[PDB]
Amino acid sequence: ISASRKLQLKTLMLQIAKQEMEREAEERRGEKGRVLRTRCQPLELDGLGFEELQDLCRQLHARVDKVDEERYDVEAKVTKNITEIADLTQKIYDLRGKFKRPTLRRVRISADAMMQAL
Amino acid sequence: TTALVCDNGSGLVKAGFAGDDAPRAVFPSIVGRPRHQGVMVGMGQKDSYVGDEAQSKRGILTLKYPIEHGIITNWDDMEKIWHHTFYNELRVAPEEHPTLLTEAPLNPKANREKMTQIMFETFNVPAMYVAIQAVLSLYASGRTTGIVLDSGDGVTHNVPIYEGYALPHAIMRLDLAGRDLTDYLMKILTERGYSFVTTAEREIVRDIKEKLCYVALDFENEMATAASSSSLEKSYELPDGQVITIGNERFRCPETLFQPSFIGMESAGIHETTYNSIMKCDIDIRKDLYANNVLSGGTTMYPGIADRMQKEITALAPSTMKIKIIAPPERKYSVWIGGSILASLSTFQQMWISKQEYDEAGPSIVHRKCF
Amino acid sequence: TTALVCDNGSGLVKAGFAGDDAPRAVFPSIVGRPRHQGVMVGMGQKDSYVGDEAQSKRGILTLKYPIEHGIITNWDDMEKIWHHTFYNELRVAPEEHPTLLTEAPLNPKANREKMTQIMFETFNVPAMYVAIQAVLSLYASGRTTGIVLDSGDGVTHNVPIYEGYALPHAIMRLDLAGRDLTDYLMKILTERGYSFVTTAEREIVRDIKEKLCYVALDFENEMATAASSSSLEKSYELPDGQVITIGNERFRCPETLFQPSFIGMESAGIHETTYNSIMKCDIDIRKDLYANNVLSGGTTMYPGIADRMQKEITALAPSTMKIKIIAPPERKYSVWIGGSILASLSTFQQMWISKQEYDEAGPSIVHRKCF
Amino acid sequence: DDIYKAAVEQLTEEQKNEFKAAFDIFVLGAEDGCISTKELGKVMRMLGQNPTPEELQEMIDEVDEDGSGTVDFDEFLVMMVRCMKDDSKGKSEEELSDLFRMFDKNADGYIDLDELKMMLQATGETITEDDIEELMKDGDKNNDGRIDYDEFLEFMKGVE
Amino acid sequence: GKRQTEREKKKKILAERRKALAIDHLNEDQLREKAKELWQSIHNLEAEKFDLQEKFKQQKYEINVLRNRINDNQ
Numbered sequence A: 001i002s003a004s005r006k007l008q009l010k011t012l013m014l015q016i017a018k019q020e021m022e023r024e025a026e027e028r029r030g031e032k033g034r035v036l037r038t039r040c041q042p043l044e045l046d047g048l049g050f051e052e053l054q055d056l057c058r059q060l061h062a063r064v065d066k067v068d069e070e071r072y073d074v075e076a077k078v079t080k081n082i083t084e085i086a087d088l089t090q091k092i093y094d095l096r097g098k099f100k101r102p103t104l105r106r107v108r109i110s111a112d113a114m115m116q117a118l
Numbered sequence B, C: 001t002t003a004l005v006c007d008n009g010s011g012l013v014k015a016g017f018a019g020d021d022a023p024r025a026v027f028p029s030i031v032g033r034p035r036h037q038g039v040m041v042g043m044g045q046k047d048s049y050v051g052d053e054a055q056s057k058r059g060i061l062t063l064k065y066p067i068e069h070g071i072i073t074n075w076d077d078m079e080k081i082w083h084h085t086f087y088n089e090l091r092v093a094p095e096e097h098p099t100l101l102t103e104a105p106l107n108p109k110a111n112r113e114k115m116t117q118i119m120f121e122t123f124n125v126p127a128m129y130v131a132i133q134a135v136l137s138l139y140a141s142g143r144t145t146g147i148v149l150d151s152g153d154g155v156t157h158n159v160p161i162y163e164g165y166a167l168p169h170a171i172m173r174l175d176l177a178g179r180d181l182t183d184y185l186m187k188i189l190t191e192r193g194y195s196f197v198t199t200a201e202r203e204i205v206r207d208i209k210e211k212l213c214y215v216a217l218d219f220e221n222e223m224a225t226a227a228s229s230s231s232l233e234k235s236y237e238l239p240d241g242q243v244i245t246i247g248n249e250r251f252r253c254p255e256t257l258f259q260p261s262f263i264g265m266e267s268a269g270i271h272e273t274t275y276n277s278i279m280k281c282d283i284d285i286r287k288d289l290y291a292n293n294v295l296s297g298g299t300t301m302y303p304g305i306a307d308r309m310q311k312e313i314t315a316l317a318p319s320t321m322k323i324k325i326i327a328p329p330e331r332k333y334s335v336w337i338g339g340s341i342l343a344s345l346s347t348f349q350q351m352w353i354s355k356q357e358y359d360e361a362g363p364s365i366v367h368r369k370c371f
Numbered sequence D: 001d002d003i004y005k006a007a008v009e010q011l012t013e014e015q016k017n018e019f020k021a022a023f024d025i026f027v028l029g030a031e032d033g034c035i036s037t038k039e040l041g042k043v044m045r046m047l048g049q050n051p052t053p054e055e056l057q058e059m060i061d062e063v064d065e066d067g068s069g070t071v072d073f074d075e076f077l078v079m080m081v082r083c084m085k086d087d088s089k090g091k092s093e094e095e096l097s098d099l100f101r102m103f104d105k106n107a108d109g110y111i112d113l114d115e116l117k118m119m120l121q122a123t124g125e126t127i128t129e130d131d132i133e134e135l136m137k138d139g140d141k142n143n144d145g146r147i148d149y150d151e152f153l154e155f156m157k158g159v160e
Numbered sequence E: 001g002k003r004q005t006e007r008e009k010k011k012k013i014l015a016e017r018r019k020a021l022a023i024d025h026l027n028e029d030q031l032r033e034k035a036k037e038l039w040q041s042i043h044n045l046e047a048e049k050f051d052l053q054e055k056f057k058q059q060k061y062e063i064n065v066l067r068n069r070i071n072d073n074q
């Protein structure tokens, strides 16, 4: 078929995919927000004595430090993920650099203007 | 700041700031004192014209190259050339710019140490680094393997590299280069009557070689054809008239590359030292080196050399391997383009020889880890 | 969850999840540091290429196997190999999977204890179990009796089993295996002019051995035929051209198995150590062992060995017994298939060495009831 | 017309006036404004940024195939938008990776032809045997059993 | 890999994450305000950990993709 028509169809597909990705991102954001709302339970502090409220706060802070520990664990895991991502990128660039070393440079800076000085 | 990628070479000094496509200023490296007496007073006659200025007043000068074969034989003249390059062709004081010189393989140590001592004491650069002229030419091709034949004007050297690991035991450096071809052409021109003797007329013979000579695909057939017909005789106009006609001197001058017995050298041509350099490598990387043979340097610009060399190597090599010869159109400045690319890298930014390091270990720092 | 059936071996590491037909990832067990200098900057050059990656860059590496003869001589390299196997070839963290290593018979204790200590401390598996490499090969054949000759690449061992009761006093372990055959082939190739010396070229000689060599049915007749005609000379193309022609080296390399006097070893061939292993057994189970002789391991893949061995044993054995040699087409992975079957059993599910047990008794738990 | 009018706005009304002045520069002039057809080659000669032979071939396919001897304003601007650099640089590497990951619903590490067909028909475009099969010839260059990662990464180079 | 060093780093970071405050030095409204503030802080904790999980999932998918494409070489 004609190249222009196929290119137009490819452009239509890419734009539709981008729109779907943005809509799915909106869905992910809303779903994550709602789930986060569900994770944190409502607090009813009305008519709470010093002992009850203080104990509840201490329990909440203990759970907070537990969350700190879990976030440290998942942080170590995500750093491992980042490290292996970097290793994969390094290996891929190594495979591509068998023929793509002179790719990164800048040429034709100022010498193309200077011609009639001599 | 930006780095200065200088490239001393031997015959043409090529320099320019890192990160561009072509050197900013390219000019012959000759320093010529006047030789006659001089009678006009107040004409403002200097004592030494360097660079491209001495290619216009060459009628009354005695040009003498300060670099013979890679090595530097006259340090005062080389210092003068560097001073000119920094101050008049680039107009950037060296106190605020790193420099990246280039050096042929297997050169004397004292040359490199004196070079770094000059750059650190006289010009007082912040940091300088010396790199082998073939690795840069491999950078410019965008490869990471391959065996590069860098036939400059001073010395022809053939450095094989695989996967970034250079093979130091397989470097074959041969001292036949463009200058010997100029001398041989000047010597065979005498067979028709044209005598060039003065050191100024060597430049005219060099121009003849550049504009007319070409490498024959098959030597004997060309010798037979030029001896019967007259379709090869190309004429050329000297700087004063009296056109000359070059016959079979056209392809006999650059043939010396493949038969160094013409100028009395014993060694084998550039077609067989490449095969020998390959065969010294390990048995498992010979296919890749066969497929990625790289040409560089000025003297490899002869019309028709990328076919003669491929034919010769295909004759020598096993019949199954594929022989491919990479001959980019920007051959002459390949080393400098590679130098610019290398100086523009972020990973390389900590390999410079910083001045405080030189102050602590002396000029012998160059042979150390900072190579 | 699923169990990891790893099988260290010596020459090829075979691994995969329990319950399949073939190992998921099979790759040579070699770790090769680069040996040259390396001039390209930023190429991303690592310090050690392991597994199948070092069989492609072997031109500039010095490959060295971490397992010599069953035993492990270089624990750091073996740890590196295991780490690669778990993380890159299977991509399953070991924190959530039991492992089933395999070990040759009659190996040093310290090797096994160090293996279990590594698996429990570094990789931190839930539970690991070590099994003898011949019982698995007997599992894969679907038998329950029989004497199995598992001629691997490191060590050849011959474990007889009857009705599920192994006979510990009749195990005949011989240290001739595929590696010694590779070295002997590399040594007899020099009789035609081909010299392979580098540790990288040992791989080329191994490929020659795999693709060309075969076991002769009768040795003297083949030696006489190859010395008169030329119907045996098969040619082979090196990794760079220059084809080579192997004459009577074809059946002389694997003949070392049946005459270990060729490489100077005193002991008797694999045709006579099987008969000796049988004769040490009781007088009433010799018929069953004669009828169910099993072959396994890589080195028993030579074309024509299942007939030579049967002829030899029939010559040695009494004339009435029937000699049958089981040679399944999936010989190479027989041990691993058996390992998968064993790990998939429900009755076996309580034999693993659980981590709490190791914490209570130390690494010496492996010699205890949990064998 | 949506893509057509987008290309129209690519060379906006200011650029339209500039190129109309240029057209008056290289037109025959001193005439009724009947508009010739050779002006599309005259602009190629005048600009220095000569259109590629692909654009001229497209013009021949579109115009002068019937020997009209003139170029429509619509066809003239069609040719003009085909010479100026209305490039999109082929999106971005991250954008390509995201779009291809969404295309790889099966997470196969590549794109399958069924995946391609579903993605295309999810846009509403008529994807029949004239598609896919031609795209097997055209969209998939390797045709090595699937559409591998580098195949479609390089396939959408410099495209919209 | 040298889990002692990892545990020491965990201890240092947790000490950085350690928050010890007054528990019997505020009135009922101040106590309720502190409870609400702690609730909001751990709510931000839940949100951030959800983000971490999502980004880790994305990273793992990209790791699988890159591993597949690098194995596709040969």
Ligand SMILES: Nc1ncnc2c1ncn2[C@@H]1O[C@H](COP(=O)(O)OP(=O)(O)O)[C@@H](O)[C@H]1O
Pocket (backbone or CB within 6 Å): B008, B009, B010, B011, B012, B013, B151, B152, B153, B154, B178, B179, B182, B206, B209, B210, B211, B297, B298, B299, B301, B302, B332
């Ligand atoms: N177009 C050309 N054709 C043939 N020979 C050339 C051409 N250009 C340069 N040369 C030869 O190459 C030499 C320049 O080589 P060059 O690469 O500048 O050496 P260096 O490595 O010292 O820079 C000149 O002396 C000349 O003899």
Ligand SMILES: Nc1ncnc2c1ncn2[C@@H]1O[C@H](COP(=O)(O)OP(=O)(O)O)[C@@H](O)[C@H]1O
Pocket (backbone or CB within 6 Å): C008, C009, C010, C011, C012, C013, C151, C152, C153, C154, C178, C179, C182, C206, C209, C210, C211, C297, C298, C299, C301, C302, C332
């Ligand atoms: N098709 C074959 N023909 C001949 N020899 C082979 C063949 N395949 C493998 N081998 C030999 O067997 C060895 C592999 O044996 P293997 O069973 O993998 O040992 P391990 O018991 O350590 O796994 C190789 O080193 C090779 O020498």
Ligand SMILES: [Mg+2]
Pocket (backbone or CB within 6 Å): B009, B010, B133, B150, B152, B153, B297, B298, B335
């Ligand atoms: Mg040079």
Ligand SMILES: [Mg+2]
Pocket (backbone or CB within 6 Å): C009, C010, C133, C150, C152, C153, C297, C298, C335
């Ligand atoms: Mg085995």
